[PDB]
Amino acid sequence: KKCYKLENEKLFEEFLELCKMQTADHPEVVPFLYNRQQRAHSLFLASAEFCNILSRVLSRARSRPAKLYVYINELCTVLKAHSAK
Template identity: 45%
Template sequence: HEWTSKEKAVAPASMADKIIVLDDDDDENDVEQRPQPSSSVHRPKNVSLPKNQHLVQTHNTQSPFSSAKKNTKALQVENQKLFDEFVQHCTPLTTECPEVLTFLQTKHSKACPDYLCSVEFRNALGQCLTQAQSNVTKTFVYISELCTVLRQ
């Protein structure tokens, strides 16, 4: 039996503690509602990350209109620092194809200075950095995503 994209494999409720769902679909357009587990299913309450991993929120949650011009220089410095951190993180992971980082750095150097100082760029950069750090197998995907953002 071949699975279609809409079919789901279902395990008995007694196995709920032993099942790990790996869902890498970032499909936000999927209108299909996923069933919620029943309250009788036992789930572990304390889930912790391995000691060498920690998640840090790297995007700005403030409204870009709250402090319009006062933070431009601070954002420029912070965005440059984050960009440098992104490149530093990706460098050892792209040794077989270093030209992708050269391409990214060229895009960055040619980008509109106003955009490089924006909250929008800060949020996109922070999201790419967080995702790249948590999923090293998709490094090239996040480099490409950042290149796309820099074309604006």
């Protein structure tokens, strides 16, 4: 039933809405995140592993957003490690 491709896009898009709201004083942060996502292997972006990662990150972002940049860093790090280049 689960389509990880669409689920990951949903989870990532939900996370970015939080980021947009809470990083408005540093406008370069959000495009950087999109850039990291843009450059990752699309199969990784559609993977169950990425889904699991996004679930944890978004969960932490929702319950404890005082460490948002921590979470942002995790996500950027993971995405860099799966860069298509």
